[PDB]
Amino acid sequence: ATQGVFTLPANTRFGVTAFANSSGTQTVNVLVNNETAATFSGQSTNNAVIGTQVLNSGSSGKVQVQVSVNGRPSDLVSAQVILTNELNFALVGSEDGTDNDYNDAVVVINWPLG
């Protein structure tokens, strides 16, 4: 199944933050309606924050996370969780290698903000 794709409420601000846990340099692209809205890059094996930004889901609401390591797309796992019918998390893990820890880039999207 498709992973890393989330339908947010249209025209809504959201936060996106990425962490790295890999020997490979992670490139995280956050797309809004298939256009790159933020790009984070960095390397860490200690969960360093490699980027954080506030974006808007825009007129379509469509948000996608893509992760690559030196031009090779990583495999993604994802889900959305809603707490108290209000607080939303869209969560992504990714795998660039063979150990299947799925933490090589970890991406957290949260809304609403403010």
Ligand X SMILES: *C(=O)C[C@@H]1O[C@@H](C)[C@@H](O)[C@@H](O)[C@@H]1O
Subset of 17-46 contacting ligand X (CB under 6 A): 21-24, 45
Q: Does 86 bind a copy of itself (CB under 8 A)?
A: yes
Q: Which residue number, 21 or 88, has a Cβ lying nearer to Ca ion?
A: 21
Element (H, E) at 5: strand 5-7
Residue nearest ligand X, CB atom distance:
97
| Residue pair 18/40 in contact by the 8 Å Cβ criterion | yes
Q: Residue 10 interacts with a copy of itself (CB under 8 A)?
A: no
Burial string for 74-94 (b: 16+ CB within 10 Å, else e) reads bebebeeeeeeeeebebbbbb
Q: Which residue in 16, 19, 20, 22 binds Ca ion (CB under 5 A)?
A: 22
Residues that bind Ca ion (CB under 5 A): 21-22, 95, 97, 99, 101, 103-104
